[PDB]
Design an enzyme around this catalytic site. Structure first.
Site, PDB file in Angstrom:
ATOM      1  N   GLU A   1     -20.461  88.044 -14.346  1.00  0.00           N
ATOM      2  CA  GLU A   1     -21.005  88.508 -15.618  1.00  0.00           C
ATOM      3  C   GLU A   1     -21.676  89.866 -15.470  1.00  0.00           C
ATOM      4  O   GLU A   1     -21.545  90.743 -16.335  1.00  0.00           O
ATOM      5  CB  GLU A   1     -21.986  87.490 -16.174  1.00  0.00           C
ATOM      6  CG  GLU A   1     -21.411  86.112 -16.305  1.00  0.00           C
ATOM      7  CD  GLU A   1     -20.213  86.074 -17.216  1.00  0.00           C
ATOM      8  OE1 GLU A   1     -20.140  86.906 -18.135  1.00  0.00           O
ATOM      9  OE2 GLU A   1     -19.341  85.208 -17.018  1.00  0.00           O
TER      10      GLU A   1
ATOM     11  N   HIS B   1      -3.906  78.324 -26.413  1.00  0.00           N
ATOM     12  CA  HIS B   1      -3.623  79.703 -26.786  1.00  0.00           C
ATOM     13  C   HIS B   1      -2.478  79.790 -27.773  1.00  0.00           C
ATOM     14  O   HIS B   1      -2.434  80.698 -28.606  1.00  0.00           O
ATOM     15  CB  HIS B   1      -3.313  80.519 -25.543  1.00  0.00           C
ATOM     16  CG  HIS B   1      -4.467  80.639 -24.614  1.00  0.00           C
ATOM     17  ND1 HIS B   1      -5.229  81.778 -24.524  1.00  0.00           N
ATOM     18  CD2 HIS B   1      -5.006  79.755 -23.747  1.00  0.00           C
ATOM     19  CE1 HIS B   1      -6.184  81.596 -23.634  1.00  0.00           C
ATOM     20  NE2 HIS B   1      -6.072  80.375 -23.149  1.00  0.00           N
TER      21      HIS B   1
HETATM   22 ZN   LIG Z   1     -15.835  87.289 -17.440  1.00  0.00          ZN
END
Ligand SMILES: [Zn+2]
Ligand SMILES: *[C@@H]1O[C@H](CO)[C@@H](O[C@@H]2O[C@H](CO)[C@@H](O)[C@H](O)[C@H]2NC(C)=O)[C@H](O)[C@H]1NC(C)=O
Ligand SMILES: *[C@@H]1O[C@H](CO)[C@@H](O[C@@H]2O[C@H](CO)[C@@H](O)[C@H](O)[C@H]2NC(C)=O)[C@H](O)[C@H]1NC(C)=O
Ligand SMILES: *[C@@H]1O[C@H](CO)[C@@H](O[C@@H]2O[C@H](CO)[C@@H](O)[C@H](O)[C@H]2NC(C)=O)[C@H](O)[C@H]1NC(C)=O
Ligand SMILES: *[C@@H]1O[C@H](CO)[C@@H](O[C@@H]2O[C@H](CO)[C@@H](O)[C@H](O)[C@H]2NC(C)=O)[C@H](O)[C@H]1NC(C)=O
Ligand SMILES: *[C@@H]1O[C@H](CO)[C@@H](O[C@@H]2O[C@H](CO)[C@@H](O)[C@H](O)[C@H]2NC(C)=O)[C@H](O)[C@H]1NC(C)=O
Ligand SMILES: *[C@@H]1O[C@H](CO)[C@@H](O[C@@H]2O[C@H](CO)[C@@H](O)[C@H](O)[C@H]2NC(C)=O)[C@H](O)[C@H]1NC(C)=O
Ligand SMILES: *[C@@H]1O[C@H](CO)[C@@H](O[C@@H]2O[C@H](CO)[C@@H](O)[C@H](O)[C@H]2NC(C)=O)[C@H](O)[C@H]1NC(C)=O
Ligand SMILES: *[C@@H]1O[C@H](CO)[C@@H](O)[C@H](O)[C@H]1NC(C)=O
EC number: 3.4.17.23
Lengths: 48, 604, 49, 48
Positions: free
Chosen positions: B356, B486
Site C-alpha cells: 500500500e 469480473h
Molecule cells: Zn495494491
C-alpha cells in the site's frame, strides 16, 4: 455430448439427484437391451 | 484561436474539478471509516454533486475539435472529456442497460445453492462455497459444489448476458469503435509521437506472441502438478490427460495457490515465517509502518507527510465503531494521502504495508500534474509497483537485516525451491487462464462466435490452452464464464496479464542498477539510491507521456517482454525439467472424466 | 428465485390479505409442493412407529 | 387426474413454471391432432 451432423452423440446416466454418481455402463447396456424394441418404434427406426 | 480557447477552458475547469473531488472523496472516506447511516446519504449527495459536474463539463468541452491542437499535454486532457461514454445511447436503451447490469451483479452477490439431501441449509458463495473448494479433499463434495454453482446460477445469467453483449456493442459502435472489445483496448493506444505509437490492434499480436514463450514453462509446471494429484485423488486422473476442472483449489481455477499443501516439494523444511519474531520483540501496528517508510527512504524516495500519520486508520478501532478494512490507499487530493487497513501483527500484513505504501509513494510523485493526468501510465502500472515493492521486502537478505530472522541463518537450496514453487503456483498459474478468458471475450464481442457456440468454444479453448477438462458436459443453456466476478460485473480482465509482465521487467531492470550478482529471486534494492532514480523518473510522469515512453525510461525498451519473467523462474525450471524425466509433459485434448462410461449412439 | 419466503411472516399475510387469484393459488400450491413433498416419507414412518 | 381400471383419466397442461396458467383446451386439441400418429406407435396402439 458431442452432437453432430451424423447425429452420433455420447450419453451417460447419473443417479436422480447426485451428480457424482454415474450408473456403470454395464447396466445401461442391459436396460437398453431390455427395452430396445420399445425405444425403436418411438422414432420409427428399425435396429439398423 | 481554438488553441488558446481550450487552454483557457481547461484552466477554469481544473479548480472546480479539484475542489469538488476533494469534497466528494472526503465523504466516502468518512463513511468507510465511520459506518453510520447518516454518512451513507451524505456520501451520495457529494458523489452525485460531483458526477453531474463531469457531464456538464463533458458536453461543454465537446466544442473544441481535436485536430487543431498542437500542445500535446492539452490534447491529452481534452480526450478524457470529449468521451461521450454511454450517454450516446438512446434513453429507454440506456436505462435498460443499467437494469441489466444491476440485475447481473445482484444474482452473483446473493444467489445461493443448497444441499440435495437437506434442502433447508442453503449456501451463499462469499462464505461457505469458497471454503469448500479451497479446503476440501473429497472428490464428490468438490464436484457437487462446482457443478451446482454453475447450474443454479450460471443458467440465470445467460439470457441477461446475451442482451448485455448486444447493448454494449451498440454503445461502442456509436463511438467510432469497432465493438466493445476494441473499446477496451482503448487504454493501450498511443497516437502520433514519432516511434512510440501503438495501435489497438497490436495488443492482440503482443499478447499472443509473448504467450508462446510461457508455454514451455507452463507445460512442465502443469505436468508436475498432475503427477502430484494422482496421489491425492487416485483412479480419477489419467496421466496423459488434462486436469478435471474442479480439482484446482479455487472455484474457477484462477489461482493454483490452494494446491500448495499437496504439491510442496520438500515437505519437511518449513518456509520462512517471522510472525513470531515480531511478537517476541513487541511490534505494534506502528513499528511496521515506520519500517516501511524507512525502507522507502533508503531507496531515495521522500518521507511521508504529517497528515499521513494524523488522519489514517492504521489500526482497527475494535469497538462497535464500525469500518471496512479492505486495505486501500487514498488520494483525496489537494495534498493529503492516507491508508486504511485493520492491521494485525503478522507477516502477510508486514508485506501488505509495503504494498500500500507503494501506491502512496506513486501518488505523491505525480501530484504536480493537471487533475486529469493523475493516474498510472496505463491500467497496469499502479499495481505493478506495489508488487515489486512487496517483492523485495520478503527476501531473507532483507529480513535478517531489519532485525528479524536471527543473523546466524543461512538459507539452503531446498527452501529456495519450496519458495519459488509457491510463487509459480500464483504467478504462472494464472497467466494462461487470464489469456484464455480475455481471448474468449474479445472473440464474442465481434461476432466471431455465433450465439449458439459460446459454451462449445469455451470448453474447446479450455482444453487447448489452459489444459483443463470439465467433469460434466455443458450444453448451450449454461453460461460458465458469466459465473466469474469480473465477467458479470463488466470489468476489463487484461490488466492482470500485462501487470504480471511489467512487474518483472521493472524488478529485473532495477537490480542491474543496484549491482546484483546472484539469481534474480534474491535481489533487494534497499540502500541503493542510484536505483531509486531510475524508478522516480517513471513515477514522476503520471499519464503525461505515452506509456511506451514511460517504460523506456526504466527498462530501456518500448514493449512488454517475457524474458525477465523466465529468468526469475530459472532455478525452478531446471529442477522441474529434471523431475519430469519419467512423465509425459503435455496433454491430449480428447480424454474426459466421463468417457469411460458413455455409450455412443448413431442414427440414420 | 432470489427472494425466498418463510411461512411465519410473508406467506401467511399473502393468503390473509391478497385479493389476487393467481397469487393466492401460487402460494397455496407451492407451499404444499415444496414442503408437503418432504414430509411424506417421514410421516409414513411416524405412523408405523 | 382420476386414474382408473379402464385406465381412462383426465389431463391438462400448464405453462412451464406458472401454476395458474392453463393452456386452453382448443390448443391441446390441435397439438395432439398434429402428433397423434407419433404418440400412437410409442405405445403400439392404433387410434382405436
Ligand atoms: Zn495494491
Ligand atoms: C453420490 O454417489 C456417491 C457414489 O459415487 C456417494 O459416495 C459414496 O459415499 C459413501 C459414504 O458417503 C462412501 O462410502 C462411498 O465410498 C462413496 N462412493 C464412492 C464411489 O466413493 C455419495 O454418497 C452420493 N451422494 C449422496 C448425497 O448420497
Ligand atoms: C461517527 O459518526 C457519528 C455521526 O454519524 C459521529 O457522532 C457525532 O459526534 C459528535 C461528537 O464528537 C457530535 O457533536 C455530533 O452531534 C455527532 N453526530 C451525530 C449525527 O450524532 C461520531 O463522532 C463519528 N465518530 C468519530 C470517531 O468521529
Ligand atoms: C502546453 O501548455 C502548458 C500550459 O497549460 C504549458 O505549460 C506551461 O509552461 C510554462 C513554461 O514551461 C510554465 O511557466 C507554465 O507554468 C506552464 N503552465 C502550467 C499551467 O503549468 C506547456 O509548456 C505547453 N507545452 C509546450 C510544449 O509548450
Ligand atoms: C459526442 O456525442 C455527440 C452527440 O451527442 C456527437 O455529435 C456532435 O454533437 C454536437 C452537439 O454537442 C454537434 O454540434 C456536432 O455537430 C455533432 N457531431 C457530428 C459529427 O454530428 C459528438 O461527435 C460526439 N463526440 C465524440 C468525441 O464522440
Ligand atoms: C542499509 O545500510 C545500513 C548502513 O549501511 C544498514 O544499517 C546497519 O545494519 C547493520 C546490521 O543490521 C548494523 O550492524 C549497523 O549498525 C547498521 N548501521 C546503521 C548506520 O544503522 C542497514 O541494515 C542496511 N539495510 C539493508 C536492508 O541492507
Ligand atoms: C542443493 O545443493 C546440494 C549441494 O550442491 C545438492 O546435493 C548434491 O547434488 C548433486 C546433484 O545430483 C549430487 O551429485 C550430490 O551427491 C549431492 N550432494 C549430497 C551431499 O547429497 C542438492 O542436489 C541440491 N538440491 C537441489 C534441489 O538442487
Ligand atoms: C401466469 O399466467 C397468468 C395468466 O393466466 C398471468 O396472469 C396475467 O397477468 C397479467 C399481468 O400480470 C394480467 O394482465 C392478466 O390479466 C393475467 N391473466 C389473467 C387470466 O388474469 C400471470 O402473470 C402468469 N405468471 C407470471 C409469473 O407471468
Ligand atoms: C524523514 O523524517 C525523519 C524523522 O522521522 C528524519 O529523521 C529524516 O531526516 C527525514 N528524511 C529526510 C530525507 O530528511
Amino acid at each position: 455430448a458431442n452432437l453432430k451432423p451424423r447425429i452420433s452423440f455420447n450419453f451417460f446416466v447419473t443417479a436422480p439427484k447426485n451428480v457424482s454418481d454415474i450408473i456403470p455402463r454395464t447396466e445401461v447396456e442391459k436396460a437398453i437391451r431390455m427395452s430396445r424394441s420399445r425405444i425403436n418404434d418411438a422414432f420409427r427406426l428399425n435396429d439398423n | 484561436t481554438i488553441e488558446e480557447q481550450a487552454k483557457t477552458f481547461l484552466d477554469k475547469f481544473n479548480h472546480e474539478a479539484e475542489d469538488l473531488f476533494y469534497q466528494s472523496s472526503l465523504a466516502s472516506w468518512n463513511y468507510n471509516t465511520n459506518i453510520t447511516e447518516e454518512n451513507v446519504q451524505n456520501m451520495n449527495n457529494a458523489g452525485d454533486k460531483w458526477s453531474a459536474f463531469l457531464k456538464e463539463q463533458s458536453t461543454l468541452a465537446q466544442m473544441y475539435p481535436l485536430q487543431e491542437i498542437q500542445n500535446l499535454t492539452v490534447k491529452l486532457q481534452l480526450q478524457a472529456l470529449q468521451q461521450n461514454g454511454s450517454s450516446v445511447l438512446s434513453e429507454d436503451k440506456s436505462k435498460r442497460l443499467n437494469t441489466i447490469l444491476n440485475t447481473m451483479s445482484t444474482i452473483y452477490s446473493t444467489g445461493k445453492v443448497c444441499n440435495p439431501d437437506n434442502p433447508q441449509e442453503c449456501l451463499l458463495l462469499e462464505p461457505g462455497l469458497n471454503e469448500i473448494m479451497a479446503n476440501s479433499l473429497d472428490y464428490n463434495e468438490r464436484l457437487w459444489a462446482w457443478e451446482s454453482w454453475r447450474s443454479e446460477v450460471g443458467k440465470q445469467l445467460r439470457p441477461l448476458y446475451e442482451e448485455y453483449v448486444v447493448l454494449k456493442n451498440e454503445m461502442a459502435r456509436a463511438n467510432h469503435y469497432e465493438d466493445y472489445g476494441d473499446y477496451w483496448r482503448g487504454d493501450y493506444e498511443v497516437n502520433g509521437v514519432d516511434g512510440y505509437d501503438y495501435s489497438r490492434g497490436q495488443l492482440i499480436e503482443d499478447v499472443e506472441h509473448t504467450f508462446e514463450e510461457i508455454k514451455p514453462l507452463y507445460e512442465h509446471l502443469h505436468a508436475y502438478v498432475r503427477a502430484k494429484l494422482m496421489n491425492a485423488y487416485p483412479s480419477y486422473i489419467s496421466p496423459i490427460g488434462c486436469l478435471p476442472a474442479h480439482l484446482l483449489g479455487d472455484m474457477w481455477g484462477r489461482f493454483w495457490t490452494n494446491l500448495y499443501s499437496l504439491t510442496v516439494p520438500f515437505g519437511q523444511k518449513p518456509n520462512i515465517d517471522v510472525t513470531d519474531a515480531m511478537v517476541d520483540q513487541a511490534w505494534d501496528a506502528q513499528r511496521i509502518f515506520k519500517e516501511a517508510e524507512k525502507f522507502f527512504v533508503s531507496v531515495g524516495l521522500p518521507n511521508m507527510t504529517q497528515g499521513f500519520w494524523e488522519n489514517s486508520m492504521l489500526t482497527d478501532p475494535g469497538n462497535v465503531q464500525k469500518a471496512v478494512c479492505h486495505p486501500t490507499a487514498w488520494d483525496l487530493g489537494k495534498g493529503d494521502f492516507r491508508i486504511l487497513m485493520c492491521t494485525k501483527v503478522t507477516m502477510d500484513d508486514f508485506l501488505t504495508a509495503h504494498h500500500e505504501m507503494g501506491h502512496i509513494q506513486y501518488d505523491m510523485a505525480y501530484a504536480a500534474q493537471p487533475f486529469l493526468l493523475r493516474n498510472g501510465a496505463n491500467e497496469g502500472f499502479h499495481e505493478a509497483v506495489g508488487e515489486i515493492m512487496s517483492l523485495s521486502a520478503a527476501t531473507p537478505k532483507h529480513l535478517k537485516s531489519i532485525g528479524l530472522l536471527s543473523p546466524d541463518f543461512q538459507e539452503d537450496n531446498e527452501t529456495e525451491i519450496n519458495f519459488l514453487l509457491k510463487q509459480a503456483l500464483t504467478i504462472v498459474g494464472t497467466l494462461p487462464f487470464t489469456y484464455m478468458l480475455e481471448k474468449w471475450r474479445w472473440m464474442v464481442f465481434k461476432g466471431e462466435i455465433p450465439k449458439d457456440q459460446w459454451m462449445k468454444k469455451w470448453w474447446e479453448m479450455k482444453r487447448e490452452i489452459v489444459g483443463v477438462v470439465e467433469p460434466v458436459p455443458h450444453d448451450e443453456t449454461y453460461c460458465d464464464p458469466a459465473s466469474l466476478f469480473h465477467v458479470s460485473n463488466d470489468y476489463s480482465f487484461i490488466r492482470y496479464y500485462t501487470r504480471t509482465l511489467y512487474q518483472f521487467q521493472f524488478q529485473e531492470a532495477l537490480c542491474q542498477a543496484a549491482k546484483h550478482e546472484g539469481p534474480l529471486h534474491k535481489c533487494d534494492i534497499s540502500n541503493s539510491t542510484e536505483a531509486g532514480q531510475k524508478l522516480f523518473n517513471m513515477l514522476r510522469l503520471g499519464k503525461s507521456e505515452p506509456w511506451t515512453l514511460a517504460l523506456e525510461n526504466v527498462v530501456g525498451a518500448k514493449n512488454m517482454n517475457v524474458r525477465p519473467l523466465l529468468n526469475y523462474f530459472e532455478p525452478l525450471f531446471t529442477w522441474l525439467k529434471d523431475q519430469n524425466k519419467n512423465s509425459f509433459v503435455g496433454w491430449s485434448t480428447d480424454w474426459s472424466p466421463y468417457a469411460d462410461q458413455s455409450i455412443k449412439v448413431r442414427i440414420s
